[PDB]
Amino acid sequence: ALILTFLGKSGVARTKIAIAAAKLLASQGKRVLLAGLAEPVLPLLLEQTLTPDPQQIAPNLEVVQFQSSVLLERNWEEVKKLEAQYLRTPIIKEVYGQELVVLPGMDSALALNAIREYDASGKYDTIVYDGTGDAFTLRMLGLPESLSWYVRRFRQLFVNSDLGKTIAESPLIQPLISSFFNQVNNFLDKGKEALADPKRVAAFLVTTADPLEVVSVRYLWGSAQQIGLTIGGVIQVSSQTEGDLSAEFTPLSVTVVPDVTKGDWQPLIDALPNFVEQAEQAPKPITIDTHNRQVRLFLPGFDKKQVKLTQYGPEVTVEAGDQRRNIFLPPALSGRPITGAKFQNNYLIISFLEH
Amino acid sequence: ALILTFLGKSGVARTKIAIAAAKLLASQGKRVLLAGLAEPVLPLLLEQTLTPDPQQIAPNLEVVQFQSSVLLERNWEEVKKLEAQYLRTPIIKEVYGQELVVLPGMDSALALNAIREYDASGKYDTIVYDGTGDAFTLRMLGLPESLSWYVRRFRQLFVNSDLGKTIAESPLIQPLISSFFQPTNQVNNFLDKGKEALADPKRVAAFLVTTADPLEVVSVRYLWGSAQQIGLTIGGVIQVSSQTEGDLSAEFTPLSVTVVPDVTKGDWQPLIDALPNFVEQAEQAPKPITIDTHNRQVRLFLPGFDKKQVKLTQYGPEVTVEAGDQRRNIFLPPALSGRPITGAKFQNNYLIISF
């Protein structure tokens, strides 16, 4: 499925857009899941009580509310089943899933895993996700890449090292495991390949003509590029500020849409863009030119003072918008000092030494 | 210090109110730190470039911007020194802070710890925190209690298990730990101090921010109850302008609703002059939880929920209150510890639980 989401500073407008996008796509024969968070506006705008299980509200249109409490207790039962299997003496079987308290980070991990399950079921063409629309959403969506980076470092250290041997053989720990007792990369790589594919994950900016909102979504735009999230376009919603925003979002299409009054969704529905086509035509977050030995990063919303580069062996780290892209350099670039990092037309062009 | 924050659906209004509150309290002689996250509105409204370190911008007014990437990197250097101090062969000494990736949850822990450090320094009377103003801010502020509960439900399960009683009754452990290189009290002391502060309206308080749009009103009422679940005092409501007219006093009884004007073209004085007395309203507001030793009762303030969506259960050693997609595991104090529940009821937005 395509995971479709929206970024912007005003939650009510984002929810209306998500609802309208879901209605439009379901009306065209796409199988749609609209998923929101634990908050009362989506139910109220739909005039429907929502639950942690998808409910059909129209042909091809199901709606679900992610309640982290419920997702946590559902995952906890999977933890118990694994515990019985892999342990001779249970330890956490006592704890009921209804007791567990949601910690920061769990919220995003549980929501992303739920989305992954819905995506993997094959039941949907589009999963419209009405999230927080902000940097927390980006950190969620970036989990496949972020976890992959950690896994690759753990492997380098706690194993794939003498330490990996001083425990792999340790006659001290071996009996301790014998008592009471990768697939990971295929799992993460699937998430990574989806996130990078605009046919599988795309987001759209939502903003009024207020310059404060405009600068906020341009910052989110650049931050999204750091994680490889395609930004397909801009939805411009109404306010007391008038303005043509096309020049502020070149080369993206800006689509001006009307409000929703008294539950008449049709004018908004009719004004929405073709999300799939615009995502497919949007700029690419990263390209690598192996002949000229250059990395080209699309980084709208930032200038050179706001972007930091770090280069440690075969890895380059790009930090911008409080996000970090780790670039593992290919053979044409590895081992060569960076000789330039200059912005041209919202792209940062990183050059590597030829001589 | 007092940590003061704002909950609401529109970030721009929340940042404006945070700036005005900081300017107000500073002009009254309080030493103020204004702290925001990685986003461009606060610097633009202040006409000041912001950094990860406090900058004075007016008498008694310093401002700082939290960047998760920098907080993580600065925490890493402390982890790397501990390696040099308590481990035979370093493992992580070659991992560089610039490369670390911020995962979900990590961002919230790093920011709360940064706040903790600024509060511990004694340099400020008020810390005005411009956060995300939503459930994610609540899960962050609730960390001391949530962590305390995990330590308290699971320590016993792991120490008294067959595998735990073996780690104490096994000679394969002592020469294991020494192959490299009570905390339970130090941890609970650190956690209990955070829980104490959060429960004290002089140390932590939040105010709701909303327009008259019924959709915003219902949203902040839900956040209001969600905040009570974590023990966060909600001192009052700030009503900002919109195309919807309305007196909101009856919607938030017994809280004061203070109507405030916009800020246009750098003129902060109308907003400043309209802000409420934060300290006094927080002192007068309802208490999230009261334990009545005499009447053997626990009274939980739970406004803004559907009563059918408040669940009380005792699956484990403590009663669990589920509401607002948050869970409170009630630690019974001495006067109530070990007394069965004998009833519970709702009344004027309070859940009264009898023992």
Residue numbers in the entry:
A (entry chain A): 2 to 182, 196 to 369
B (entry chain B): 2 to 182, 193 to 366
List sentences from the manuscript.
In the eukaryotic cytoplasm, Get3 delivers tail-anchored (TA) integral membrane proteins, defined by a single transmembrane helix at their C terminus, to the endoplasmic reticulum. Get3d is conserved across land plants and photosynthetic bacteria and includes a distinctive C-terminal α-crystallin domain. Distinct features of Get3d include an incomplete active site, a “closed” conformation in the apo-state, and a hydrophobic chamber. Both homologs have ATPase activity and are capable of binding TA proteins, supporting a potential role in TA protein targeting.
We solve the atomic structure of a plant Get3d and further refine a previously deposited structure of a cyanobacterial Get3d. In AtGet3d, the α-helical CBD is enclosed by additional helices not seen in the deposited Get3d structure from Nostoc sp.. With this map, we could clearly identify additional density consistent with the helices of AtGet3d that enclosed the CBD. We built into this density adding 41 residues total and further refined the NosGet3d structure with refinement statistics in Table S1. Overall, NosGet3d is structurally very similar to the AtGet3d structure (backbone RMSD = 2.33 Å). As with AtGet3d, NosGet3d has some unidentified densities in the hydrophobic chamber. One prominent difference is that the helices enclosing the CBD in NosGet3d are further from the bottom of the chamber than in AtGet3d, resulting in a larger hydrophobic chamber. In cytoplasmic Get3 proteins, it has been shown that the highly conserved aspartate in switch I coordinates a water, helping to align the water for nucleophilic attack on the γ-phosphate. This aspartate is conserved in the Get3d family, with NosGet3d uniquely having a glutamate at this position, further supporting its evolutionary drift. The catalytic aspartate in Get3, D57 in yeast, coordinates water and primes it for nucleophilic attack of the γ-phosphate of ATP. This residue is highly conserved in Get3d proteins; however, it is a glutamate in NosGet3d, which may contribute to its lower Vmax. To investigate this, the ATPase activities of AtGet3d and NosGet3d were determined by monitoring the phosphate produced by Get3d in a spectrophotometric assay. Both AtGet3d and NosGet3d were found to have ATPase activity, with a Vmax of 12.0 ± 0.1 and 3.2 ± 0.1 nmol Pi/min/mg Get3 and kcat of 1.10 ± 0.01 and 0.28 ± 0.01 min−1, respectively.
